[PDB]
Protein backbone atom coordinates (compact mmCIF):
# COMPACT_ATOMS: atom_id res chain seq x y z
CA UNK A 1 0.00 0.00 0.00
CA UNK A 2 2.82 2.21 0.29
CA UNK A 3 3.88 3.39 -3.38
CA UNK A 4 6.27 6.17 -2.61
CA UNK A 5 8.32 7.99 0.27
CA UNK A 6 9.32 11.17 0.34
CA UNK A 7 11.71 12.29 2.95
CA UNK A 8 15.71 13.10 3.98
CA UNK A 9 18.54 10.77 2.98
CA UNK A 10 19.97 10.11 6.33
CA UNK A 11 22.48 7.61 5.19
CA UNK A 12 23.50 5.83 2.21
CA UNK A 13 24.84 1.84 2.35
CA UNK A 14 24.39 0.22 -0.37
CA UNK A 15 22.09 -1.75 -0.98
CA UNK A 16 20.52 0.07 1.93
CA UNK A 17 19.01 3.43 2.30
CA UNK A 18 17.67 5.04 5.54
CA UNK A 19 15.14 7.74 4.15
CA UNK A 20 13.43 9.81 7.26
CA UNK A 21 9.65 10.84 6.68
CA UNK A 22 8.47 12.35 9.36
CA UNK A 23 10.81 11.22 12.02
CA UNK A 24 10.60 7.78 11.08
CA UNK A 25 13.73 6.51 9.39
CA UNK A 26 12.59 3.57 6.51
CA UNK A 27 14.86 1.22 5.16
CA UNK A 28 14.83 1.25 1.58
CA UNK A 29 16.65 -1.58 -0.91
CA UNK A 30 17.63 -0.57 -4.34
CA UNK A 31 19.06 -1.22 -6.77
CA UNK A 32 23.15 -0.38 -7.04
CA UNK A 33 22.98 1.66 -10.17
CA UNK A 34 19.98 3.74 -8.37
CA UNK A 35 22.39 5.13 -6.01
CA UNK A 36 23.97 7.28 -8.48
CA UNK A 37 21.05 9.92 -8.94
CA UNK A 38 20.58 9.76 -5.31
CA UNK A 39 20.46 13.25 -3.63
CA UNK A 40 23.44 13.96 -1.00
CA UNK A 41 22.89 12.97 2.59
CA UNK A 42 20.99 15.74 4.41
CA UNK A 43 18.98 16.31 1.02
CA UNK A 44 15.04 15.11 0.01
CA UNK A 45 14.93 12.21 -1.82
CA UNK A 46 11.28 10.97 -3.90
CA UNK A 47 11.60 7.21 -4.56
CA UNK A 48 9.09 4.71 -6.02
CA UNK A 49 8.57 1.85 -3.42
CA UNK A 50 7.17 -1.99 -3.74
CA UNK A 51 6.12 -3.26 -0.94
CA UNK A 52 7.23 -6.81 -0.27
CA UNK A 53 4.89 -8.97 2.69
CA UNK A 54 5.46 -12.13 4.05
CA UNK A 55 4.81 -13.60 7.16
CA UNK A 56 8.07 -12.67 9.07
CA UNK A 57 9.34 -10.22 7.27
CA UNK A 58 7.90 -6.60 6.38
CA UNK A 59 10.39 -5.21 3.24
CA UNK A 60 10.68 -2.16 0.70
CA UNK A 61 11.94 -1.83 -2.61
CA UNK A 62 12.80 1.42 -3.82
CA UNK A 63 13.31 2.74 -7.40
CA UNK A 64 14.85 6.27 -9.08
CA UNK A 65 11.49 5.99 -11.52
CA UNK A 66 8.39 4.30 -12.16
CA UNK A 67 9.84 2.55 -15.34
CA UNK A 68 12.04 0.53 -12.78
CA UNK A 69 9.63 -0.72 -10.14
CA UNK A 70 7.73 -1.85 -13.11
CA UNK A 71 9.90 -4.01 -14.30
CA UNK A 72 10.88 -5.42 -11.06
CA UNK A 73 7.35 -6.13 -10.00
CA UNK A 74 6.93 -8.01 -13.65
CA UNK A 75 10.54 -9.57 -12.96
CA UNK A 76 9.79 -11.03 -9.72
CA UNK A 77 5.97 -12.55 -11.06
CA UNK A 78 8.37 -15.26 -12.24
CA UNK A 79 9.01 -18.22 -10.36
CA UNK A 80 12.85 -18.68 -9.20
CA UNK A 81 13.01 -14.82 -9.41
CA UNK A 82 12.98 -13.65 -6.40
CA UNK A 83 13.31 -9.75 -4.81
CA UNK A 84 17.00 -10.36 -4.22
CA UNK A 85 17.51 -11.48 -7.85
CA UNK A 86 15.71 -9.04 -9.21
CA UNK A 87 18.08 -6.26 -7.36
CA UNK A 88 21.03 -8.02 -8.98
CA UNK A 89 19.38 -8.10 -12.38
CA UNK A 90 18.49 -4.19 -11.98
CA UNK A 91 22.24 -3.69 -10.54
CA UNK A 92 24.04 -5.74 -13.46
CA UNK A 93 22.25 -3.75 -15.75
CA UNK A 94 20.25 -0.65 -16.78
CA UNK A 95 16.62 -0.71 -17.85
CA UNK A 96 16.76 -0.25 -21.65
CA UNK A 97 19.91 -3.29 -21.60
CA UNK A 98 17.41 -5.49 -20.07
CA UNK A 99 14.72 -4.89 -22.66
CA UNK A 100 17.14 -4.62 -25.54
CA UNK A 101 18.56 -7.88 -24.31
CA UNK A 102 14.74 -9.97 -23.72
CA UNK A 103 13.51 -8.71 -27.18
CA UNK A 104 16.61 -10.15 -29.01
CA UNK A 105 16.51 -13.72 -27.15
CA UNK A 106 19.94 -12.49 -25.91
CA UNK A 107 20.59 -15.13 -23.03
CA UNK A 108 23.90 -14.77 -22.78
CA UNK A 109 23.49 -11.47 -21.06
CA UNK A 110 21.43 -12.74 -18.24
CA UNK A 111 23.92 -15.84 -17.64
CA UNK A 112 26.69 -13.62 -16.49
CA UNK A 113 24.93 -11.58 -13.68
CA UNK A 114 25.13 -13.12 -10.35
CA UNK A 115 23.27 -16.65 -9.31
CA UNK A 116 20.79 -16.84 -12.58
CA UNK A 117 20.94 -19.82 -14.10
CA UNK A 118 21.15 -21.08 -17.31
CA UNK A 119 17.22 -22.55 -17.69
CA UNK A 120 15.78 -19.55 -15.73
CA UNK A 121 17.69 -17.12 -18.12
CA UNK A 122 15.73 -18.64 -21.08
CA UNK A 123 12.20 -18.81 -18.89
CA UNK A 124 12.84 -15.30 -18.04
CA UNK A 125 13.30 -13.77 -21.10
CA UNK A 126 9.81 -15.77 -22.64
CA UNK A 127 8.19 -14.60 -20.10
CA UNK A 128 9.22 -11.30 -19.94
CA UNK A 129 8.42 -10.75 -23.72
CA UNK A 130 5.67 -11.98 -23.64
CA UNK A 131 4.84 -9.77 -20.45
CA UNK A 132 5.79 -6.68 -22.16
CA UNK A 133 3.26 -6.11 -24.78
CA UNK A 134 0.64 -5.20 -22.23
CA UNK A 135 2.27 -1.93 -20.66
CA UNK A 136 3.66 1.30 -20.81
CA UNK A 137 6.68 3.62 -19.87
CA UNK A 138 9.71 5.97 -20.51
CA UNK A 139 11.84 2.91 -21.48
CA UNK A 140 9.64 1.41 -23.83
CA UNK B 1 -6.96 -0.11 11.39
CA UNK B 2 -6.84 2.82 9.05
CA UNK B 3 -10.15 4.17 8.36
CA UNK B 4 -9.46 7.48 6.79
CA UNK B 5 -6.97 9.32 4.71
CA UNK B 6 -6.34 13.09 4.50
CA UNK B 7 -3.49 14.61 1.64
CA UNK B 8 -2.41 15.44 -1.76
CA UNK B 9 -3.77 13.35 -4.79
CA UNK B 10 -0.22 12.52 -6.03
CA UNK B 11 -1.17 11.19 -9.14
CA UNK B 12 -4.43 9.06 -10.65
CA UNK B 13 -3.89 5.82 -12.12
CA UNK B 14 -7.43 4.39 -12.29
CA UNK B 15 -7.97 2.08 -10.81
CA UNK B 16 -4.95 3.57 -8.54
CA UNK B 17 -4.18 6.72 -6.11
CA UNK B 18 -1.65 8.01 -5.05
CA UNK B 19 -2.20 9.59 -2.22
CA UNK B 20 0.39 11.20 0.01
CA UNK B 21 0.07 12.04 3.68
CA UNK B 22 3.19 13.47 5.37
CA UNK B 23 5.71 12.12 2.98
CA UNK B 24 4.48 8.78 2.82
CA UNK B 25 2.43 8.07 -0.60
CA UNK B 26 -0.10 5.46 -0.27
CA UNK B 27 -1.84 3.36 -3.09
CA UNK B 28 -5.57 3.56 -2.78
CA UNK B 29 -7.78 1.30 -4.94
CA UNK B 30 -11.59 2.84 -5.97
CA UNK B 31 -13.98 1.81 -7.97
CA UNK B 32 -14.10 3.72 -11.14
CA UNK B 33 -16.90 5.45 -10.59
CA UNK B 34 -15.91 7.20 -7.24
CA UNK B 35 -12.37 8.40 -9.68
CA UNK B 36 -14.50 10.75 -11.63
CA UNK B 37 -15.58 12.99 -8.14
CA UNK B 38 -11.99 13.55 -6.99
CA UNK B 39 -10.13 16.27 -7.26
CA UNK B 40 -7.53 17.06 -9.06
CA UNK B 41 -3.97 16.12 -8.73
CA UNK B 42 -2.50 18.60 -6.22
CA UNK B 43 -5.83 19.10 -4.22
CA UNK B 44 -6.54 17.64 -1.18
CA UNK B 45 -8.79 14.95 -0.83
CA UNK B 46 -10.55 12.89 1.94
CA UNK B 47 -11.02 8.90 1.15
CA UNK B 48 -12.70 6.75 3.34
CA UNK B 49 -10.64 3.53 2.89
CA UNK B 50 -11.06 -0.54 3.93
CA UNK B 51 -7.61 -2.10 4.81
CA UNK B 52 -7.74 -5.78 3.83
CA UNK B 53 -4.63 -7.60 5.61
CA UNK B 54 -3.73 -11.28 4.00
CA UNK B 55 -0.14 -13.05 4.50
CA UNK B 56 1.10 -11.58 1.12
CA UNK B 57 -0.36 -8.52 1.26
CA UNK B 58 -1.71 -5.06 2.90
CA UNK B 59 -4.11 -3.08 0.53
CA UNK B 60 -6.26 -0.27 0.53
CA UNK B 61 -9.25 0.31 -1.02
CA UNK B 62 -10.91 3.43 -0.96
CA UNK B 63 -14.28 5.37 -1.36
CA UNK B 64 -16.21 8.68 -1.73
CA UNK B 65 -18.65 7.77 1.60
CA UNK B 66 -19.00 5.81 4.61
CA UNK B 67 -22.36 4.34 2.16
CA UNK B 68 -19.99 2.63 -0.45
CA UNK B 69 -17.47 1.70 2.15
CA UNK B 70 -20.35 -0.28 3.98
CA UNK B 71 -21.65 -1.49 0.83
CA UNK B 72 -18.09 -2.47 -0.65
CA UNK B 73 -17.59 -4.61 3.43
CA UNK B 74 -20.77 -6.56 2.84
CA UNK B 75 -20.44 -7.52 -0.85
CA UNK B 76 -17.00 -9.09 0.19
CA UNK B 77 -18.45 -11.45 2.93
CA UNK B 78 -20.80 -13.41 0.30
CA UNK B 79 -18.49 -16.28 -1.08
CA UNK B 80 -17.32 -16.22 -4.42
CA UNK B 81 -17.01 -12.12 -4.37
CA UNK B 82 -13.76 -10.64 -3.79
CA UNK B 83 -12.75 -7.29 -3.49
CA UNK B 84 -11.78 -7.29 -7.43
CA UNK B 85 -15.18 -8.09 -7.91
CA UNK B 86 -17.00 -5.58 -5.60
CA UNK B 87 -14.83 -2.99 -7.37
CA UNK B 88 -17.02 -3.72 -10.61
CA UNK B 89 -19.99 -3.98 -8.64
CA UNK B 90 -19.52 0.32 -7.73
CA UNK B 91 -17.66 0.55 -10.63
CA UNK B 92 -19.80 -1.20 -13.28
CA UNK B 93 -22.64 0.79 -11.45
CA UNK B 94 -23.75 3.23 -8.49
CA UNK B 95 -24.44 2.70 -5.44
CA UNK B 96 -27.88 3.75 -5.88
CA UNK B 97 -28.50 1.41 -8.21
CA UNK B 98 -27.66 -2.04 -6.45
CA UNK B 99 -29.76 -1.64 -3.33
CA UNK B 100 -32.53 -1.44 -5.55
CA UNK B 101 -31.93 -4.09 -7.51
CA UNK B 102 -31.09 -6.30 -4.38
CA UNK B 103 -34.73 -5.67 -2.62
CA UNK B 104 -36.91 -5.45 -6.17
CA UNK B 105 -35.06 -8.46 -6.78
CA UNK B 106 -34.49 -8.12 -10.43
CA UNK B 107 -31.56 -10.85 -11.51
CA UNK B 108 -30.85 -9.03 -15.02
CA UNK B 109 -29.32 -5.86 -14.18
CA UNK B 110 -26.33 -7.50 -12.09
CA UNK B 111 -25.53 -9.78 -15.00
CA UNK B 112 -24.30 -7.40 -17.78
CA UNK B 113 -21.11 -6.43 -15.58
CA UNK B 114 -17.84 -7.97 -15.93
CA UNK B 115 -17.44 -11.73 -14.86
CA UNK B 116 -19.74 -11.71 -12.24
CA UNK B 117 -22.09 -15.15 -12.07
CA UNK B 118 -25.60 -15.92 -13.52
CA UNK B 119 -25.94 -17.93 -10.11
CA UNK B 120 -24.12 -15.68 -8.42
CA UNK B 121 -26.66 -12.63 -9.65
CA UNK B 122 -28.61 -14.66 -8.35
CA UNK B 123 -26.91 -15.79 -4.75
CA UNK B 124 -26.09 -11.95 -4.71
CA UNK B 125 -29.77 -10.80 -4.45
CA UNK B 126 -30.52 -13.20 -2.30
CA UNK B 127 -27.36 -12.94 0.48
CA UNK B 128 -27.32 -9.37 -0.24
CA UNK B 129 -31.23 -8.90 0.90
CA UNK B 130 -30.72 -10.04 4.52
CA UNK B 131 -27.65 -7.91 5.26
CA UNK B 132 -29.58 -5.09 4.21
CA UNK B 133 -32.11 -5.06 7.15
CA UNK B 134 -29.67 -4.73 9.41
CA UNK B 135 -27.55 -1.00 9.27
CA UNK B 136 -27.97 2.31 8.26
CA UNK B 137 -26.78 5.24 5.84
CA UNK B 138 -27.53 7.79 3.41
CA UNK B 139 -27.91 5.67 1.05
CA UNK B 140 -30.41 3.78 2.76
CA UNK C 1 4.47 -1.73 18.54
CA UNK C 2 1.83 1.09 18.58
CA UNK C 3 1.23 1.87 22.32
CA UNK C 4 -0.48 5.56 22.26
CA UNK C 5 -2.25 7.85 19.53
CA UNK C 6 -2.64 11.47 19.84
CA UNK C 7 -4.51 13.55 17.44
CA UNK C 8 -8.17 14.78 16.66
CA UNK C 9 -11.60 13.20 16.83
CA UNK C 10 -12.92 13.08 13.78
CA UNK C 11 -16.33 10.82 14.36
CA UNK C 12 -17.17 8.69 17.58
CA UNK C 13 -19.88 6.05 16.96
CA UNK C 14 -19.54 3.37 19.40
CA UNK C 15 -17.81 1.18 19.72
CA UNK C 16 -15.27 2.86 17.05
CA UNK C 17 -13.80 6.50 17.35
CA UNK C 18 -12.04 7.74 13.71
CA UNK C 19 -8.76 9.48 15.02
CA UNK C 20 -6.91 11.63 12.30
CA UNK C 21 -2.65 11.58 13.75
CA UNK C 22 -1.23 13.67 10.52
CA UNK C 23 -3.81 12.85 8.10
CA UNK C 24 -4.06 9.33 8.81
CA UNK C 25 -7.38 8.27 10.28
CA UNK C 26 -7.26 5.50 12.47
CA UNK C 27 -10.23 3.43 13.61
CA UNK C 28 -9.70 2.46 17.38
CA UNK C 29 -12.28 0.13 19.39
CA UNK C 30 -13.12 1.31 22.82
CA UNK C 31 -14.95 0.37 26.26
CA UNK C 32 -18.23 1.89 25.77
CA UNK C 33 -17.60 3.59 29.02
CA UNK C 34 -14.39 5.21 27.80
CA UNK C 35 -17.46 7.38 25.95
CA UNK C 36 -17.86 9.45 28.87
CA UNK C 37 -14.09 10.97 28.78
CA UNK C 38 -13.88 11.49 25.25
CA UNK C 39 -13.15 15.14 24.44
CA UNK C 40 -15.58 16.61 21.95
CA UNK C 41 -15.42 15.90 17.63
CA UNK C 42 -12.69 18.62 16.58
CA UNK C 43 -10.37 18.38 19.55
CA UNK C 44 -7.04 16.96 20.77
CA UNK C 45 -7.42 13.21 22.64
CA UNK C 46 -4.65 10.66 24.25
CA UNK C 47 -5.63 7.21 23.77
CA UNK C 48 -3.42 4.16 24.90
CA UNK C 49 -3.54 1.10 22.54
CA UNK C 50 -2.82 -2.34 22.22
CA UNK C 51 -2.19 -3.61 18.87
CA UNK C 52 -3.65 -6.78 17.61
CA UNK C 53 -2.52 -8.33 14.64
CA UNK C 54 -3.68 -11.40 12.89
CA UNK C 55 -2.93 -12.80 9.26
CA UNK C 56 -6.17 -11.16 8.06
CA UNK C 57 -6.30 -8.27 10.74
CA UNK C 58 -4.70 -5.02 12.10
CA UNK C 59 -6.64 -4.26 15.00
CA UNK C 60 -6.47 -1.34 17.65
CA UNK C 61 -8.06 -1.59 21.11
CA UNK C 62 -7.94 1.56 22.79
CA UNK C 63 -8.29 2.89 26.78
CA UNK C 64 -8.09 6.31 28.49
CA UNK C 65 -5.77 4.98 30.71
CA UNK C 66 -2.74 2.90 31.27
CA UNK C 67 -4.76 0.90 33.89
CA UNK C 68 -7.58 -0.15 31.97
CA UNK C 69 -5.31 -1.50 29.13
CA UNK C 70 -3.13 -3.79 31.64
CA UNK C 71 -6.86 -5.21 32.60
CA UNK C 72 -7.84 -5.89 28.94
CA UNK C 73 -4.15 -7.21 28.05
CA UNK C 74 -4.58 -9.85 30.91
CA UNK C 75 -8.46 -10.29 30.47
CA UNK C 76 -7.30 -11.69 26.59
CA UNK C 77 -4.56 -13.89 27.98
CA UNK C 78 -7.56 -16.48 29.09
CA UNK C 79 -8.39 -19.02 26.96
CA UNK C 80 -12.15 -18.32 25.80
CA UNK C 81 -11.51 -14.50 26.24
CA UNK C 82 -10.68 -12.65 23.38
CA UNK C 83 -10.78 -8.80 22.43
CA UNK C 84 -14.23 -8.48 22.04
CA UNK C 85 -15.18 -10.18 24.86
CA UNK C 86 -13.12 -8.14 26.92
CA UNK C 87 -14.80 -5.17 25.76
CA UNK C 88 -17.90 -6.18 27.04
CA UNK C 89 -16.67 -6.90 30.50
CA UNK C 90 -15.00 -3.56 30.24
CA UNK C 91 -18.48 -2.04 29.13
CA UNK C 92 -20.14 -3.58 31.39
CA UNK C 93 -18.62 -2.50 34.93
CA UNK C 94 -15.65 -0.02 35.63
CA UNK C 95 -11.98 -1.02 35.92
CA UNK C 96 -12.80 -0.90 39.84
CA UNK C 97 -15.92 -3.05 40.09
CA UNK C 98 -14.00 -5.99 38.49
CA UNK C 99 -11.10 -6.10 40.56
CA UNK C 100 -13.53 -5.97 43.37
CA UNK C 101 -15.64 -8.71 41.81
CA UNK C 102 -12.87 -10.59 41.25
CA UNK C 103 -10.79 -10.57 44.52
CA UNK C 104 -14.02 -11.90 46.90
CA UNK C 105 -14.98 -14.46 44.41
CA UNK C 106 -18.50 -12.92 42.76
CA UNK C 107 -18.52 -15.01 39.47
CA UNK C 108 -22.50 -14.14 39.96
CA UNK C 109 -20.99 -10.37 38.62
CA UNK C 110 -19.76 -11.97 35.37
CA UNK C 111 -22.69 -13.90 34.34
CA UNK C 112 -24.62 -10.83 33.95
CA UNK C 113 -22.45 -9.69 31.20
CA UNK C 114 -23.09 -10.64 27.44
CA UNK C 115 -22.21 -14.08 26.26
CA UNK C 116 -19.83 -14.55 28.95
CA UNK C 117 -19.78 -18.46 30.44
CA UNK C 118 -20.72 -19.72 33.65
CA UNK C 119 -17.79 -22.28 33.60
CA UNK C 120 -15.50 -19.26 32.04
CA UNK C 121 -16.48 -16.63 34.81
CA UNK C 122 -15.22 -18.87 37.49
CA UNK C 123 -11.93 -19.60 35.12
CA UNK C 124 -11.60 -16.05 34.94
CA UNK C 125 -11.87 -15.37 38.49
CA UNK C 126 -9.24 -17.71 39.34
CA UNK C 127 -6.99 -16.74 36.53
CA UNK C 128 -7.24 -13.22 36.97
CA UNK C 129 -7.13 -13.10 41.32
CA UNK C 130 -3.73 -15.15 40.14
CA UNK C 131 -2.35 -12.61 37.76
CA UNK C 132 -3.36 -9.41 39.59
CA UNK C 133 -0.35 -10.03 42.45
CA UNK C 134 2.02 -9.27 40.10
CA UNK C 135 1.79 -5.79 38.99
CA UNK C 136 0.93 -1.88 40.06
CA UNK C 137 -1.56 0.90 39.30
CA UNK C 138 -3.88 3.82 40.46
CA UNK C 139 -7.11 0.95 40.32
CA UNK C 140 -4.81 -1.39 42.31
CA UNK D 1 11.47 -1.89 7.38
CA UNK D 2 11.57 0.31 10.02
CA UNK D 3 15.39 1.27 11.11
CA UNK D 4 15.45 4.61 12.79
CA UNK D 5 12.88 6.49 15.05
CA UNK D 6 13.21 9.89 16.07
CA UNK D 7 10.98 11.57 18.44
CA UNK D 8 10.11 12.51 21.89
CA UNK D 9 10.61 9.96 25.12
CA UNK D 10 7.30 9.62 26.50
CA UNK D 11 8.15 7.58 29.16
CA UNK D 12 10.58 4.67 30.41
CA UNK D 13 9.51 1.73 32.03
CA UNK D 14 12.54 -0.63 31.71
CA UNK D 15 12.46 -2.57 29.24
CA UNK D 16 10.11 -0.35 27.19
CA UNK D 17 10.73 3.12 25.77
CA UNK D 18 7.66 4.94 24.27
CA UNK D 19 9.03 7.69 22.12
CA UNK D 20 6.48 9.71 20.10
CA UNK D 21 7.11 10.60 16.44
CA UNK D 22 4.69 12.66 14.76
CA UNK D 23 1.27 11.60 17.27
CA UNK D 24 2.17 7.88 17.06
CA UNK D 25 3.48 6.52 20.45
CA UNK D 26 5.89 3.57 19.20
CA UNK D 27 7.10 1.22 21.92
CA UNK D 28 10.36 0.29 21.62
CA UNK D 29 12.17 -2.69 23.50
CA UNK D 30 15.99 -2.09 24.57
CA UNK D 31 18.92 -3.63 26.30
CA UNK D 32 18.83 -2.33 30.17
CA UNK D 33 21.87 -0.72 29.66
CA UNK D 34 21.23 1.77 27.02
CA UNK D 35 18.18 2.64 29.06
CA UNK D 36 20.68 4.61 31.39
CA UNK D 37 21.99 6.07 27.97
CA UNK D 38 19.16 7.72 27.29
CA UNK D 39 17.81 11.23 27.56
CA UNK D 40 14.85 12.40 29.86
CA UNK D 41 11.26 12.02 29.17
CA UNK D 42 10.09 15.40 27.27
CA UNK D 43 13.55 15.62 25.22
CA UNK D 44 14.56 14.26 21.95
CA UNK D 45 15.87 10.27 21.43
CA UNK D 46 17.32 8.50 18.35
CA UNK D 47 17.36 4.95 18.68
CA UNK D 48 18.04 2.40 15.77
CA UNK D 49 15.40 0.08 15.41
CA UNK D 50 15.09 -3.64 14.33
CA UNK D 51 11.45 -4.79 12.96
CA UNK D 52 10.56 -8.22 14.22
CA UNK D 53 6.76 -9.00 12.30
CA UNK D 54 5.49 -12.32 13.22
CA UNK D 55 1.46 -13.81 12.37
CA UNK D 56 0.30 -12.93 15.89
CA UNK D 57 2.96 -9.66 17.11
CA UNK D 58 4.99 -6.52 15.55
CA UNK D 59 7.87 -5.42 17.55
CA UNK D 60 10.54 -2.70 18.06
CA UNK D 61 13.76 -3.62 19.06
CA UNK D 62 15.54 -0.28 20.06
CA UNK D 63 19.59 0.52 20.61
CA UNK D 64 21.79 3.47 21.30
CA UNK D 65 24.12 3.01 17.97
CA UNK D 66 24.52 0.66 14.92
CA UNK D 67 27.33 -1.53 16.38
CA UNK D 68 24.40 -3.17 19.17
CA UNK D 69 21.71 -3.33 16.46
CA UNK D 70 24.13 -5.73 14.61
CA UNK D 71 25.47 -7.67 17.08
CA UNK D 72 21.66 -8.06 18.35
CA UNK D 73 20.75 -9.40 14.53
CA UNK D 74 23.16 -12.08 14.49
CA UNK D 75 22.31 -13.46 18.50
CA UNK D 76 19.09 -13.93 17.40
CA UNK D 77 20.42 -16.10 14.56
CA UNK D 78 21.34 -18.71 16.83
CA UNK D 79 19.09 -21.45 17.40
CA UNK D 80 17.91 -21.27 20.93
CA UNK D 81 18.48 -17.77 21.39
CA UNK D 82 15.40 -15.41 20.85
CA UNK D 83 15.00 -11.57 21.37
CA UNK D 84 14.34 -12.26 25.27
CA UNK D 85 17.31 -13.98 25.21
CA UNK D 86 19.63 -11.62 23.53
CA UNK D 87 18.58 -8.08 24.73
CA UNK D 88 20.13 -10.40 28.05
CA UNK D 89 23.57 -10.68 26.15
CA UNK D 90 23.42 -6.58 25.95
CA UNK D 91 21.51 -6.05 28.80
CA UNK D 92 23.71 -8.12 31.71
CA UNK D 93 26.81 -7.14 29.66
CA UNK D 94 28.13 -4.46 27.24
CA UNK D 95 28.83 -4.75 23.83
CA UNK D 96 32.28 -4.44 24.27
CA UNK D 97 32.80 -6.94 27.23
CA UNK D 98 30.73 -10.13 24.97
CA UNK D 99 32.73 -9.84 21.42
CA UNK D 100 36.06 -10.65 23.33
CA UNK D 101 34.55 -13.06 25.26
CA UNK D 102 34.03 -15.12 21.83
CA UNK D 103 37.26 -14.16 20.14
CA UNK D 104 39.19 -15.50 23.39
CA UNK D 105 36.39 -18.24 23.93
CA UNK D 106 36.01 -17.61 27.50
CA UNK D 107 32.69 -19.59 28.92
CA UNK D 108 32.83 -18.57 32.21
CA UNK D 109 32.21 -15.23 31.45
CA UNK D 110 28.53 -16.01 29.53
CA UNK D 111 27.21 -18.23 32.14
CA UNK D 112 26.00 -16.20 35.09
CA UNK D 113 23.76 -14.55 32.44
CA UNK D 114 20.10 -14.95 32.89
CA UNK D 115 18.71 -18.40 31.64
CA UNK D 116 20.84 -18.61 28.76
CA UNK D 117 22.33 -22.41 28.65
CA UNK D 118 25.73 -24.15 29.39
CA UNK D 119 25.95 -25.73 26.12
CA UNK D 120 24.34 -22.96 24.93
CA UNK D 121 26.86 -20.84 26.33
CA UNK D 122 29.43 -23.09 24.26
CA UNK D 123 27.15 -22.72 20.96
CA UNK D 124 27.04 -18.86 21.49
CA UNK D 125 31.42 -18.46 21.46
CA UNK D 126 31.43 -21.51 18.45
CA UNK D 127 28.95 -19.84 16.45
CA UNK D 128 29.07 -16.10 16.80
CA UNK D 129 33.19 -16.46 16.18
CA UNK D 130 31.86 -17.51 12.75
CA UNK D 131 29.76 -14.30 11.80
CA UNK D 132 32.44 -12.10 13.61
CA UNK D 133 34.81 -12.41 10.80
CA UNK D 134 32.36 -10.81 8.44
CA UNK D 135 31.14 -7.15 8.97
CA UNK D 136 32.79 -3.90 10.23
CA UNK D 137 32.03 -1.40 12.92
CA UNK D 138 33.01 0.82 15.47
CA UNK D 139 32.45 -1.95 18.04
CA UNK D 140 34.49 -4.23 15.56
Known amino acids: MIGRLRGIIIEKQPPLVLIEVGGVGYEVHMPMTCFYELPEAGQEAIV ?3 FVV ?3 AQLL ?3 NNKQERTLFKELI ?3 GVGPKLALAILSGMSAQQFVNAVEREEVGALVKLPGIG ?3 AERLIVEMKDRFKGLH ?3 F
Open 137 to 139: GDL
Open 54 to 56: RED
Open 48 to 50: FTH
Open 61 to 63: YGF
Open 118 to 120: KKT
Open 77 to 79: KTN
